[PDB]
Design a protein around this ligand. Sequence first.
Ligand SMILES: [K+]
Ligand SMILES: [K+]
Ligand SMILES: [K+]
Ligand SMILES: [K+]
Ligand SMILES: [K+]
Ligand SMILES: [Mg+2]
Ligand SMILES: [Mg+2]
Ligand SMILES: [Mg+2]
Ligand SMILES: [Mg+2]
Ligand SMILES: [Mg+2]
Ligand SMILES: [Mg+2]
Ligand SMILES: [Mg+2]
Ligand SMILES: [Mg+2]
Ligand SMILES: [Mg+2]
Ligand SMILES: [Mg+2]
Ligand SMILES: [Mg+2]
Ligand SMILES: [Mg+2]
Ligand SMILES: [Mg+2]
Ligand SMILES: [Mg+2]
Ligand SMILES: [Mg+2]
Ligand SMILES: [Mg+2]
Ligand SMILES: [Mg+2]
Ligand SMILES: [Mg+2]
Ligand SMILES: [Mg+2]
Ligand SMILES: [Mg+2]
Ligand SMILES: [Mg+2]
Ligand SMILES: [Mg+2]
Ligand SMILES: [Mg+2]
Ligand SMILES: [Mg+2]
Ligand SMILES: [Mg+2]
Ligand SMILES: [Mg+2]
Ligand SMILES: [Mg+2]
Ligand SMILES: [Mg+2]
Ligand SMILES: [Mg+2]
Ligand SMILES: [Mg+2]
Ligand SMILES: [Mg+2]
Ligand SMILES: [Mg+2]
Ligand SMILES: [Mg+2]
Ligand SMILES: [Mg+2]
Ligand SMILES: [Mg+2]
Ligand SMILES: [Mg+2]
Ligand SMILES: [Mg+2]
Ligand SMILES: [Mg+2]
Ligand SMILES: [Mg+2]
Ligand SMILES: [Mg+2]
Ligand SMILES: [Mg+2]
Ligand SMILES: [Mg+2]
Ligand SMILES: [Mg+2]
Ligand SMILES: [Mg+2]
Ligand SMILES: [Mg+2]
Ligand SMILES: [Mg+2]
Ligand SMILES: [Mg+2]
Ligand SMILES: [Mg+2]
Ligand SMILES: [Mg+2]
Ligand SMILES: [Mg+2]
Ligand SMILES: [Mg+2]
Ligand SMILES: [Mg+2]
Ligand SMILES: [Mg+2]
Ligand SMILES: [Mg+2]
Ligand SMILES: [Mg+2]
Ligand SMILES: [Mg+2]
Ligand SMILES: [Mg+2]
Ligand SMILES: [Mg+2]
Ligand SMILES: [Mg+2]
Ligand SMILES: [Mg+2]
Ligand SMILES: [Mg+2]
Ligand SMILES: [Mg+2]
Ligand SMILES: [Mg+2]
Ligand SMILES: [Mg+2]
Ligand SMILES: [Mg+2]
Ligand SMILES: [Mg+2]
Ligand SMILES: [Mg+2]
Ligand SMILES: [Mg+2]
Ligand SMILES: [Mg+2]
Ligand SMILES: [Mg+2]
Ligand SMILES: [Mg+2]
Ligand SMILES: [Mg+2]
Ligand SMILES: [Mg+2]
Ligand SMILES: [Mg+2]
Ligand SMILES: [Mg+2]
Ligand SMILES: [Mg+2]
Ligand SMILES: [Mg+2]
Ligand SMILES: [Mg+2]
Ligand SMILES: [Mg+2]
Ligand SMILES: [Mg+2]
Ligand SMILES: [Mg+2]
Ligand SMILES: [Mg+2]
Ligand SMILES: [Mg+2]
Ligand SMILES: [Mg+2]
Ligand SMILES: [Mg+2]
Ligand SMILES: [Mg+2]
Ligand SMILES: [Mg+2]
Ligand SMILES: [Mg+2]
Ligand SMILES: [Mg+2]
Ligand SMILES: [Mg+2]
Ligand SMILES: [Mg+2]
Ligand SMILES: [Mg+2]
Ligand SMILES: [Mg+2]
Ligand SMILES: [Mg+2]
Ligand SMILES: [Mg+2]
Ligand SMILES: [Mg+2]
Ligand SMILES: [Mg+2]
Ligand SMILES: [Mg+2]
Ligand SMILES: [Mg+2]
Ligand SMILES: [Mg+2]
Ligand SMILES: [Mg+2]
Ligand SMILES: [Mg+2]
Ligand SMILES: [Mg+2]
Ligand SMILES: [Mg+2]
Ligand SMILES: [Mg+2]
Ligand SMILES: [Mg+2]
Ligand SMILES: [Mg+2]
Ligand SMILES: [Mg+2]
Ligand SMILES: [Mg+2]
Ligand SMILES: [Mg+2]
Ligand SMILES: [Mg+2]
Ligand SMILES: [Mg+2]
Ligand SMILES: [Mg+2]
Ligand SMILES: [Mg+2]
Ligand SMILES: [Mg+2]
Ligand SMILES: [Mg+2]
Ligand SMILES: [Mg+2]
Ligand SMILES: [Mg+2]
Lengths: 78, 65, 49
Amino acid sequence: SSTKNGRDSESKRLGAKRADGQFVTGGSILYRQRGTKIYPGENVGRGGDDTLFAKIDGVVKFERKGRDKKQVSVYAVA
Amino acid sequence: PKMKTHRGAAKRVKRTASGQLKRSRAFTSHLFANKSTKQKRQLRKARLVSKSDMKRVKQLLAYKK
Amino acid sequence: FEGGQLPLFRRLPKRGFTNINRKEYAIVNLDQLNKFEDGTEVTPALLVE
RNA sequence: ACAUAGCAUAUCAGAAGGCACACCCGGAGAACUGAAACAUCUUAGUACCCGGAGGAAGAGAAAGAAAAUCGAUUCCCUUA
RNA sequence: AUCCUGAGUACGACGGAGCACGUGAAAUUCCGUCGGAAUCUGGGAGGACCAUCUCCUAAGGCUAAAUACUCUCUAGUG
RNA sequence: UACAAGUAGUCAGAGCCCGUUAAUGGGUGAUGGCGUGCCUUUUGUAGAAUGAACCGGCGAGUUACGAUUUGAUGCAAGGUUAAGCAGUAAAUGUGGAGCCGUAGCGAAAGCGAGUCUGAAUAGGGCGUUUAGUAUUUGGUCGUAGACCCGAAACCAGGUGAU
RNA sequence: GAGGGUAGCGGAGAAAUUCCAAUCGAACCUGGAGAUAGCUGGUUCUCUCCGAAAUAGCUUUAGGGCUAGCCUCAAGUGAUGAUUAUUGGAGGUAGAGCACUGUUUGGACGAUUCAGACAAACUCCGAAUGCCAAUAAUUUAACUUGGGAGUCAGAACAUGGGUGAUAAGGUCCGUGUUCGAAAGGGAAACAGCCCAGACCACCAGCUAAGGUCCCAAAAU
RNA sequence: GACAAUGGUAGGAGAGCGUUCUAAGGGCGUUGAAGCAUGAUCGUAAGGACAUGUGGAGCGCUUAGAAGUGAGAAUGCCGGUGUGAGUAGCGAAAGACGGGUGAGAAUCCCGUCCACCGAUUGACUAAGGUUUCCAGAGGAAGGCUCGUCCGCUCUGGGUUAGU
RNA sequence: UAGGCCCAAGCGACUGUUUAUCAAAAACACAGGUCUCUGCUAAACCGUAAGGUGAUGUAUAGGGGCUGACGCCUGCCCGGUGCUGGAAGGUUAAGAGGAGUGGUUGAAGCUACGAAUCGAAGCCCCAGUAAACGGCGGCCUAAGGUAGCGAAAUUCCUUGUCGGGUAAGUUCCGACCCGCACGAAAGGCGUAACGAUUUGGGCACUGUCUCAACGAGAGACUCGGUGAAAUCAUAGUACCUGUGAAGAUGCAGGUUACCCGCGACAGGACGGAAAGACCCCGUGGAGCUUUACUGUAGCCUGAUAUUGAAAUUCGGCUUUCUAACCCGCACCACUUAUCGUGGUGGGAGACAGUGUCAGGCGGGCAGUUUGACUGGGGCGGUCGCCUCCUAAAAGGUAACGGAGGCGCUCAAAGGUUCCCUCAGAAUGGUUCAUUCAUAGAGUGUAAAGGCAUAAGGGAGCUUGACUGCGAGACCUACAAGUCGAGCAGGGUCGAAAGACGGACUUAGUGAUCCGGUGGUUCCGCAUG
RNA sequence: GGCCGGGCCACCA
Ligand SMILES: [K+]
Ligand SMILES: [K+]
Ligand SMILES: [K+]
Ligand SMILES: [K+]
Ligand SMILES: [K+]
Ligand SMILES: [Mg+2]
Ligand SMILES: [Mg+2]
Ligand SMILES: [Mg+2]
Ligand SMILES: [Mg+2]
Ligand SMILES: [Mg+2]
Ligand SMILES: [Mg+2]
Ligand SMILES: [Mg+2]
Ligand SMILES: [Mg+2]
Ligand SMILES: [Mg+2]
Ligand SMILES: [Mg+2]
Ligand SMILES: [Mg+2]
Ligand SMILES: [Mg+2]
Ligand SMILES: [Mg+2]
Ligand SMILES: [Mg+2]
Ligand SMILES: [Mg+2]
Ligand SMILES: [Mg+2]
Ligand SMILES: [Mg+2]
Ligand SMILES: [Mg+2]
Ligand SMILES: [Mg+2]
Ligand SMILES: [Mg+2]
Ligand SMILES: [Mg+2]
Ligand SMILES: [Mg+2]
Ligand SMILES: [Mg+2]
Ligand SMILES: [Mg+2]
Ligand SMILES: [Mg+2]
Ligand SMILES: [Mg+2]
Ligand SMILES: [Mg+2]
Ligand SMILES: [Mg+2]
Ligand SMILES: [Mg+2]
Ligand SMILES: [Mg+2]
Ligand SMILES: [Mg+2]
Ligand SMILES: [Mg+2]
Ligand SMILES: [Mg+2]
Ligand SMILES: [Mg+2]
Ligand SMILES: [Mg+2]
Ligand SMILES: [Mg+2]
Ligand SMILES: [Mg+2]
Ligand SMILES: [Mg+2]
Ligand SMILES: [Mg+2]
Ligand SMILES: [Mg+2]
Ligand SMILES: [Mg+2]
Ligand SMILES: [Mg+2]
Ligand SMILES: [Mg+2]
Ligand SMILES: [Mg+2]
Ligand SMILES: [Mg+2]
Ligand SMILES: [Mg+2]
Ligand SMILES: [Mg+2]
Ligand SMILES: [Mg+2]
Ligand SMILES: [Mg+2]
Ligand SMILES: [Mg+2]
Ligand SMILES: [Mg+2]
Ligand SMILES: [Mg+2]
Ligand SMILES: [Mg+2]
Ligand SMILES: [Mg+2]
Ligand SMILES: [Mg+2]
Ligand SMILES: [Mg+2]
Ligand SMILES: [Mg+2]
Ligand SMILES: [Mg+2]
Ligand SMILES: [Mg+2]
Ligand SMILES: [Mg+2]
Ligand SMILES: [Mg+2]
Ligand SMILES: [Mg+2]
Ligand SMILES: [Mg+2]
Ligand SMILES: [Mg+2]
Ligand SMILES: [Mg+2]
Ligand SMILES: [Mg+2]
Ligand SMILES: [Mg+2]
Ligand SMILES: [Mg+2]
Ligand SMILES: [Mg+2]
Ligand SMILES: [Mg+2]
Ligand SMILES: [Mg+2]
Ligand SMILES: [Mg+2]
Ligand SMILES: [Mg+2]
Ligand SMILES: [Mg+2]
Ligand SMILES: [Mg+2]
Ligand SMILES: [Mg+2]
Ligand SMILES: [Mg+2]
Ligand SMILES: [Mg+2]
Ligand SMILES: [Mg+2]
Ligand SMILES: [Mg+2]
Ligand SMILES: [Mg+2]
Ligand SMILES: [Mg+2]
Ligand SMILES: [Mg+2]
Ligand SMILES: [Mg+2]
Ligand SMILES: [Mg+2]
Ligand SMILES: [Mg+2]
Ligand SMILES: [Mg+2]
Ligand SMILES: [Mg+2]
Ligand SMILES: [Mg+2]
Ligand SMILES: [Mg+2]
Ligand SMILES: [Mg+2]
Ligand SMILES: [Mg+2]
Ligand SMILES: [Mg+2]
Ligand SMILES: [Mg+2]
Ligand SMILES: [Mg+2]
Ligand SMILES: [Mg+2]
Ligand SMILES: [Mg+2]
Ligand SMILES: [Mg+2]
Ligand SMILES: [Mg+2]
Ligand SMILES: [Mg+2]
Ligand SMILES: [Mg+2]
Ligand SMILES: [Mg+2]
Ligand SMILES: [Mg+2]
Ligand SMILES: [Mg+2]
Ligand SMILES: [Mg+2]
Ligand SMILES: [Mg+2]
Ligand SMILES: [Mg+2]
Ligand SMILES: [Mg+2]
Ligand SMILES: [Mg+2]
Ligand SMILES: [Mg+2]
Ligand SMILES: [Mg+2]
Ligand SMILES: [Mg+2]
Ligand SMILES: [Mg+2]
Ligand SMILES: [Mg+2]
Ligand SMILES: [Mg+2]
Ligand SMILES: [Mg+2]
Ligand SMILES: [Mg+2]
Ligand SMILES: [Mg+2]
């Protein structure tokens, strides 16, 4: 006969876009995601589609928050 | 004989000082209810013909200075 | 030709018009007037000559 | 019926047909092809056909070009 | 400016064609069918159209040269 | 050279016969090792896929006009003429109309080292803070049949009922 | 039999797509005309340096094309390339587990409980690796802008998987190698396996895979 | 001098060989040019010389310029020549002998006998062909063998209408 | 030299005709039947026309369709399609008719447009017609198969079943009816005669065969003469097992083999011949079809010109007239003439015909289109977007692999401030209460990732579901797509910090060209 | 979409 399957959507290239310890400029996307898999930390914003972005120039730090949650911050380079 | 300008192309681009081609944006004719406000606002802004496209179409506009 | 993909100069819109009465001027900058002696009377005939 | 049509005779020797008919003017006029299909469009008013000529032909003496004025037509450059 | 100055003409509708231009904001030129002016206070054009302005004076004809070609002829050339 | 199994050569090699552009020479070759032509097309061809009987001749990216780029050369905020005229079908002289450049931005009116958008003394796009131009060799593209050969077909005008 | 008539957008046919000058679903000749041919075939001297691809996206597209990827040439720019060490981080595979979802076996008590199992679309957990970065060692690229491409039929082997039947020299993806475009030694022969990358010459030497009784080099 | 690099298809880059023609310069050649043939020659390759024979009048070299500039394949075009091979075939059939002619005879002429057709392999008209008809001479080619013969070759002839 | 014959079945009545060159037949024709058109300048046909055929014929004639001697017959359905006739009710073009409006010059005027209404055929509607196209059930229809025939030139199952014929019969003959899927002029069922037709049986007869033998001649073979051809990379060209582009003369290992002919045979050289006719592919061709698209020859219909005069009746309609136009009507002349022209009668007549314009019909003819993927193609399925798994712990990653969803919705289900917390279980009550209950609920919708900062629930106010943008970044061949701090203008909510450029996030969409609408310090062809 | 009571007509991103 025939298959009823065969469909899929375009992959959305989610995940980390900058490395921990890397210097980024303001507006740089740090993380693409659905929901808050990683939370916005210090000097980091959360866009309408849950994109995390740096609000300042600085160094990216991925850190833990609480017991089972994560966050990413950006800190001004001294 | 002389090379002939692509008149359709000539109606859609202008040459810049450095030799690039300023172009208008697609998706700007109708169906504006389906595009968001920011989409339309930013689609009002002109772009350039990309280098990959220039490699293909440069001879069509050799006379348009 | 892009093999049947809609070509670039069809997917882009036309823009603008051409003014029939478009006036274009010959331009002389200040730095080009420095070649004349002090007290000279500059005129299109003199600039052409 | 007048007339005309027609008919006979003399006089003229006007036409006919040909071509390098290459160029020229006119009548008539495709298709393969291109458009990556195809009908509008293109090939192209091209090929072929027909008519008429000349040493050239056609055009030509502004109910024009223009917008500061030029002064018939044609042809070359350029505009492009 | 008293008289004359090209009439089924110019022009218009419909259908076409020629104009670089596919009827389009399409002026300008021509053909078929049908209609159909004005008369120097006139008429036409300046890319729809109107007004002013500007230029011209249709609906008769003639005209060399610059230009096109080579079956040929004469003399030559690569 | 008549006990021998093979893309016919190649490398090794006695024997025999010669003697050169005189060279660590020429002809032939018992016997041993190694070894499935060429071209095309293919993932892959000894291919039992294609093509060629052999030999000879002939037989396929050219030229014109435009574009772009590179090298060369002249001049340089300038560079250069086209037709035409003169000249020997020449070089060349003359010819500055025209073309490109010296300024960009804007759909345009316009403004101008800025300009466009904008209410903006904001931000942003494209620009400014020199180098072009003419000819020409090479490469490539475009219009031409455009590297060469090859259809089945389509159209037009003719010729055929021996 | 003779003399005639009907002609190709047509004739003629007691009809067969049948005949029209030895092949008629539309005769023959010449011209348009070098029609068009994204198809097949062919394309001619030499050496030197470098050297691919058989992929993605879109395509009335699928043996074609376009841009990107990979090759080359020339100018720029200059740490931006590569590898390792260390450090930090993102993420849920292998394994494992049953805390959730679903599946399942035997008890107990009257759904819960005890014990024991299963999972690509289960997870209380969770590696090795790979990846992204930051500042030392070794190394030699890297990027930008232009000129010129070719490629878009891939193949085997190993390995992680789908599909098939834990079939295929099957097919479709990931990863690596080789072939393609690579001769030389080994695997009897044998593109894709093992060793190894041929500038030329030598009747020198050391080794690799693989071998050492004879064929046939080296241990009866 | 001392280190490195140098397998390669599509393809990119570079440098060269050779062909014809042109300009300029300088040369060769009847005491022998080009071409051709042979050779044991030189160069990293494309390729370049020399010597000898043949040939009998044109041709190199240098620098630069220009191209109808290089073939092994296209079931390529034209020409020549192989192979298959002394092979297949030699196109419906009854001939034998004597004599002649001749350089040559199964094959030509003559003779006898034999045999075949005979509602025709006989005779005469038409179409069509157009000299093939006759005589004398010939034997290169044509004749599917031969050939002295011939519808073949050479030379000369031949068709007569009032019905 | 000179018919073989008999019994039986299918098909076609018969003589005839046909694919020159693989088919002679059951195919065509046929006499006969029926339907239909055609009143004569017939219809039909050729031709642009003139002119012709039809026909020097005239409905007992001529064209076209179907059937196919003859015999007995030919049922049911008119809903659909075609054809024929009615109704002038709706709809429609040219043309007429001009109410009105814009541009320009307070206007004319010039100019661009423009509704009442009049206006044919067709189409819609009604009726009829089946020897028209067709249809002849599974309560539905227009109606549900009559006679005759039936395992058939039709029957898949199937060699149906039974009988006959044979020792044995998938063929044949006779029956049955369960007709996959007979059936009455694309005729049904029979039928003497006829047939180089198909099929079964029998007698005669035989080298067809058991089973081959001999003989004659022509070739073949030997000799003399003459002398081709297809083919051909070079060839000193073995076999076996294996290898290999998976079937080897040519590779490996063995085995076998002195050199060169001649007569024979065909296993191999994937032998020769023809760039596979099958199959697929090419945005190849050609012929053919049609309710594919677009046209068109032709025809029908209306207006108008040619085209005139009177009336009646409601711009028309109708009638009459003659003088345009017409007559393949008669006579007359040119003229010995079935052409033509002219003359005179007669007929017809402003019709017809013809031009221009318009509407309709129009495979009669023409130009073309009629997708791709695909474990060959077709058929089936699929084609864009979103989510998950496959996917090998970054990202990416295929199959006609495994699962689902989208082409929206909400004026709150948006913004802000304040407040709040669920499902379930147990236990009590003729929805409420208590207790646990980290969420096992909910989140508009598919899934995944998130969410008790709640992103889930309620309320107050409100419209940021703002205008101009935008450092930087993700994604990416391009075109697109995505996120975004922050600046400015004006706000909403909040005491305030502050939040707000829609929605817990990720689908809910479509380029360009063209056109419509609104605005506009832009252009607008001498000037306004 | 037009017009009339579903039918005719019209429609070249
Ligand atoms: K073959
Ligand atoms: K009916
Ligand atoms: K009916
Ligand atoms: K039966
Ligand atoms: K049947
Ligand atoms: Mg995905
Ligand atoms: Mg949103
Ligand atoms: Mg718009
Ligand atoms: Mg005369
Ligand atoms: Mg005369
Ligand atoms: Mg003449
Ligand atoms: Mg003439
Ligand atoms: Mg085309
Ligand atoms: Mg003529
Ligand atoms: Mg003439
Ligand atoms: Mg006048
Ligand atoms: Mg026109
Ligand atoms: Mg015009
Ligand atoms: Mg116009
Ligand atoms: Mg006018
Ligand atoms: Mg032996
Ligand atoms: Mg021996
Ligand atoms: Mg042998
Ligand atoms: Mg060997
Ligand atoms: Mg290859
Ligand atoms: Mg293959
Ligand atoms: Mg070979
Ligand atoms: Mg072979
Ligand atoms: Mg082939
Ligand atoms: Mg061959
Ligand atoms: Mg040859
Ligand atoms: Mg080329
Ligand atoms: Mg290119
Ligand atoms: Mg003819
Ligand atoms: Mg016949
Ligand atoms: Mg045939
Ligand atoms: Mg047929
Ligand atoms: Mg024939
Ligand atoms: Mg042509
Ligand atoms: Mg050709
Ligand atoms: Mg290399
Ligand atoms: Mg591929
Ligand atoms: Mg498409
Ligand atoms: Mg596991
Ligand atoms: Mg269990
Ligand atoms: Mg279990
Ligand atoms: Mg798991
Ligand atoms: Mg396998
Ligand atoms: Mg495979
Ligand atoms: Mg792999
Ligand atoms: Mg390699
Ligand atoms: Mg190898
Ligand atoms: Mg090897
Ligand atoms: Mg080996
Ligand atoms: Mg073995
Ligand atoms: Mg070996
Ligand atoms: Mg092996
Ligand atoms: Mg050793
Ligand atoms: Mg050994
Ligand atoms: Mg040994
Ligand atoms: Mg090399
Ligand atoms: Mg090497
Ligand atoms: Mg090159
Ligand atoms: Mg060179
Ligand atoms: Mg050279
Ligand atoms: Mg010479
Ligand atoms: Mg050549
Ligand atoms: Mg050849
Ligand atoms: Mg030969
Ligand atoms: Mg031979
Ligand atoms: Mg012999
Ligand atoms: Mg033989
Ligand atoms: Mg023989
Ligand atoms: Mg013989
Ligand atoms: Mg004979
Ligand atoms: Mg006899
Ligand atoms: Mg004679
Ligand atoms: Mg002879
Ligand atoms: Mg003679
Ligand atoms: Mg019969
Ligand atoms: Mg008969
Ligand atoms: Mg036949
Ligand atoms: Mg056959
Ligand atoms: Mg026959
Ligand atoms: Mg008649
Ligand atoms: Mg019949
Ligand atoms: Mg019958
Ligand atoms: Mg009936
Ligand atoms: Mg009815
Ligand atoms: Mg009407
Ligand atoms: Mg009407
Ligand atoms: Mg069946
Ligand atoms: Mg029997
Ligand atoms: Mg029976
Ligand atoms: Mg029937
Ligand atoms: Mg019937
Ligand atoms: Mg018998
Ligand atoms: Mg014999
Ligand atoms: Mg012999
Ligand atoms: Mg091999
Ligand atoms: Mg094998
Ligand atoms: Mg074998
Ligand atoms: Mg061997
Ligand atoms: Mg033999
Ligand atoms: Mg054989
Ligand atoms: Mg064969
Ligand atoms: Mg073929
Ligand atoms: Mg074929
Ligand atoms: Mg086959
Ligand atoms: Mg009419
Ligand atoms: Mg058709
Ligand atoms: Mg065509
Ligand atoms: Mg397909
Ligand atoms: Mg298939
Ligand atoms: Mg389907
Ligand atoms: Mg991974
Ligand atoms: Mg991943
Ligand atoms: Mg779905
Ligand atoms: Mg859907
Ligand atoms: Mg809430
Ligand atoms: Mg909300
Ligand atoms: Mg004007
Ligand atoms: Mg104006």
